[PDB]
Homo-oligomer: A and B are copies of this chain.
Amino acid sequence: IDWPALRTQARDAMSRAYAPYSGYPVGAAALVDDGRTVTGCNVENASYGLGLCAECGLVSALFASGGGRLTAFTCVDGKGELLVPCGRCRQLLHEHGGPDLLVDTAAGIRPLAALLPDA
């Protein structure tokens, strides 16, 4: 796993985000078990509760590009700092990466099971 290259893809995705309501763009990138990278950016909506997280876009892009399992994940904010996914996004990642998905956090790389136990 090339974590700097994954973080670079996440920062590039962050630059594409639609976040005019919060002013808080987010980008995410993940390695799929076939070796390819998929990315997402957040897309906010005037009805706040319809906003899509970057991880939502990433999971949609996972299947649009052929499916598979996530093996490594990173998320970054508009300053390029590492972000831990919100609880909803942890649940999406669990479905497609499982407990052993590696998650890039500001405190260090963590298995998803350490971030969402008993899921």
A29 to chain B, nearest CB (A): 11
User: Do most interface residues of chain A lie in helix, strand or loop, or is the interface mixed?
Assistant: mixed
Q: Interface residues of A, CB < 8 Å — how many?
A: 49
A43 CB contact (under 8 Å) in B18, B60, B86, B89: B60
Q: Which B residues are in CB contact (< 8 Å) with A3?
A: none
Docked pose: A69 CA to B69 CA in angstroms: 31
Asked if A109 is at the interface of the complex by the 8 Å CB criterion, the answer is no
Known: A46-B95, A86-B119, A89-B87. A60 touches B61 (CB 8 A): yes
B63 touches A60 (CB 8 A): no
User: Which positions in A face B, CB cutoff 8 Å?
Assistant: 13, 16-18, 21-22, 39-53, 56-57, 59-64, 66-67, 84, 86-92, 94-95, 105, 107, 114-119
**Other A-B pairs beyond A18-B63, A21-B22, A88-B91, 16, CB < 8 Å:** A41-B63, A42-B49, A43-B62, A47-B87, A47-B88, A48-B48, A48-B51, A49-B88, A50-B86, A50-B87, A51-B51, A57-B61, A87-B88, A87-B92, A90-B90, A107-B118
